[PDB]
C-alpha cells in the first residue's frame, strides 16, 4: 500500500478564488492533493499567496512521504499564488527540474461570459 517514485509532476492551478496543488507520476496518477479550501482558508484568504504556500508545502510533504525527489512544475491559471507555490515546493526539499505554464490559451473558439457590471 506504498508508492515509491523518484521523478514526478506537481500540478498547481491558481485561480483568483482558490489554489489547488497535486503530485502525480510522469503518467498522471494522483497520490495526494492540497487546496486552500481543504487547508481551511475561506473567502478572500484563499487567493492569498500564503494559502498557496501552505497548500504546496502540504502536498510536497505528502509527495516526499511517498518518496518523491525530483518534480516538474505544471502551472495553470493567472492567480497570484503560483510563485509562492513554486517557492514552497523548492523549500520542501523537492528538486524542481523545470517549470512550465500550461494555461490553456484559447484560440477564437468559444464565446466568453458577459462582462460583469459590478
Amino acid at each position: 500500500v506504498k508508492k515509491n517514485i523518484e521523478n514526478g509532476v506537481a500540478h498547481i492551478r491558481s485561480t483568483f478564488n482558490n489554489t489547488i496543488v497535486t503530485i502525480t507520476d510522469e503518467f498522471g496518477n494522483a497520490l495526494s492533493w492540497s487546496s486552500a479550501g481543504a487547508l481551511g482558508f475561506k473567502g478572500s484568504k484563499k487567493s492569498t499567496p500564503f494559502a498557496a504556500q501552505m497548500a504546496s508545502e502540504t502536498a510536497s510533504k505528502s509527495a516526499m512521504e511517498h518518496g518523491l525527489k525530483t518534480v516538474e512544475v505544471t502551472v495553470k491559471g493567472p492567480g497570484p499564488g503560483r510563485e509562492s507555490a513554486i517557492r514552497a515546493l523548492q523549500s520542501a526539499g523537492l528538486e524542481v527540474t523545470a517549470i512550465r505554464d500550461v494555461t490553456p490559451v484559447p484560440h477564437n473558439g468559444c464565446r466568453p461570459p458577459k462582462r460583469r457590471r459590478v
Binding site: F41, S44, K45, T48, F50, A51
Partner: protein, 148 residues
Amino acid sequence: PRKGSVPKRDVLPDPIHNSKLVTKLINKIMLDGKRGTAQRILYSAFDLVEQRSGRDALEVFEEAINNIMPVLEVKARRSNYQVPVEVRPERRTTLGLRWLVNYARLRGEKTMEDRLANEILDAANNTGGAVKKREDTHKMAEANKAFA
C-alpha cells in the same frame, strides 16, 4: 494633514532602582498628578512581590513585562482589512505597562499595592490578565497572518 513626527519625551530613572521602565510605570499609575501616591503604591507592590517570590523585584518585573509585551498587532488598512504588523519597541513598553496597570486595577484585592503585586507575579508566571490580552492579540494577528 501632519507635517511629521514629534520628539519623544525622556523620563529619569527610578531613584532607587534606576529604571526608566519603573519611572514610566509610576507615570502610568499616577492619577490627577498624585506622583507621591503613585510612587508609594509602586514601591509597596515591589516590596510585596519581593517578599512573596524571594527573587529580585526588578528581575521579576522585567520577566513580567517581557511576558506581557506583544510583538504583533492588527492594524486596519485599505477593500478594508486588518493586517498584522510588528510593534515598535516603544509601543511594546507602552502596551506592556498599560495592560499591566489596567488589568491590575480590575483584580479583586483590596488595595492597589496588592493588586499590582499580584498582577506582576501572575504576569511573571505567564498566567495573568495582561498575559491573556497579549495572547489574544497574538492569535488574532496569526489569524490575519495571510494579509501581511
